[PDB]
A = this chain, B = another copy of it.
Amino acid sequence: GNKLFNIAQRILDTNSVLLTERGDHIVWINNSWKFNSEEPLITKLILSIRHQLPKEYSSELLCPRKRKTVEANIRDMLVDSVETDTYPDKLPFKNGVLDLVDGMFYSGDDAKKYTCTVSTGFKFDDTKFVEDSPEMEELMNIINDIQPLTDENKKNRELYEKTLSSCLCGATKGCLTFFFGETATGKSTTKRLLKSAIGDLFVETGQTILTDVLDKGPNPFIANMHLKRSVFCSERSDNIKKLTEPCNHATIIIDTNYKPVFDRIDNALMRRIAVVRFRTLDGKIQNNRYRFAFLYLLVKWYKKYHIPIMKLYPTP
């Protein structure tokens, strides 16, 4: 007849605290799948959930030790692990997610089964996520200057569109991309536009990922890629074959200034290699005014190309 055990059972029934394969407890507070290995949030979860329980049950959660007892019961009652970040066609935010093939924004319980732990780093407000704005005029004008919307540059433009749209897929990508061009030819502009568009779903690394073995010494560059949907390499064939394995949601794109050279050249790596060529403001980018419009363009391109199947073709 333990009332605290019934409290623990009722809280566990709501599917709020989950055990992941990595040995951690993920909790659901304030419309976000938080997790902290250092300090557990189970007590905070109980204190926040206190409101949705009957009056006799909700009146004991104020003591700082009954909550510890309930935490012990809950962490003793979690036996099996769960699989998270299984849906690739959803884009996270700090107050919901975005479904792309149909293209609407979910919040609260309506987006809780979508167990995704990583986020983008900025909230979502849909009143400015519509085409009717001057800002989109400026943005696609900048896009057309950096990449002309013409016939002589049709294939390059479409490959650019597909490559930048592929960064929203929450799954493994099996094709390397290079941005090859000259100095001040939009590479910095493109990387900044991307990192303003998606945000925390983006990590920028260096040359080291393409010169050293990925399993020697303490190397976070393999660990900082964990559940990131975009990796931009600025500044080895085995590395090339390594980055295209499921274990990894990163679209691998390296910006280059000169013609590349590989350790070996064969047909094995030529089926995973694509390239584009560049042959052609900043103040309001850290301000991030060009954030939702570029996301809308990327969503439109994803709807244009990657609804039925997501797959990148090499361009030898």
A interface with B by C-beta (< 8 Å): 1-2, 5, 23, 29-30, 38-41, 43-44, 47-48, 59, 62-65, 67, 69, 72-73, 75-77, 79-80, 182-184, 204, 206-208, 212-216, 221, 234-235, 238, 241-242, 246-247, 257, 266-268, 271, 283, 286, 309
Contacts and interface: CB of A to CB of B under 8 A. Distances in A.
Contacts of A221: 215
B47 A76 contact: yes
Nearest to A34: B79
Nearest to A30: B79
Contact of A266 (B79, B183, B207): B183
Contacts of A216: 206, 208, 212
A38 B63 contact: no
A267 B184 contact: yes
Nearest to A46: B76
Contact of A64 (B44, B76, B234): B76
A271 B188 CA distance: 15
Main secondary structure of the interface of A (DSSP, over half): loop
Given A183-B267, A184-B268, A267-B183, A76 B207 contact: no
Given A23-B39, A72-B64, A208 B204 contact: no
A271 B185 CA distance: 14
Contacts of A208: 213, 215-216
A44 B75 CA distance: 9
Contacts of A79: 29-30, 41, 44, 48
Contacts of A271: 183-184
Given A64-B69, A183-B266, A183-B268, 19 more contacts: A1-B59, A5-B62, A29-B79, A40-B75, A40-B76, A43-B76, A64-B72, A64-B73, A67-B76, A184-B268, A204-B247, A206-B213, A206-B216, A207-B213, A207-B215, A208-B216, A234-B242, A235-B241, A235-B242
B63 A2 contact: yes
Contacts of A214: 206
A235 B1 CA distance: 58
A43 B5 CA distance: 15
Contact of A246 (B241, B267, B286): B286
19 contacts: A1-B62, A2-B59, A30-B79, A40-B75, A41-B79, A44-B76, A44-B79, A47-B76, A48-B79, A64-B72, A65-B69, A183-B271, A184-B267, A204-B247, A206-B213, A206-B214, A207-B215, A208-B216, A257-B266
Nearest to A283: B309
A265 to B, nearest CB: 12
Contacts of A40: 75-76
A207 B67 CA distance: 46
A300 B268 CA distance: 34
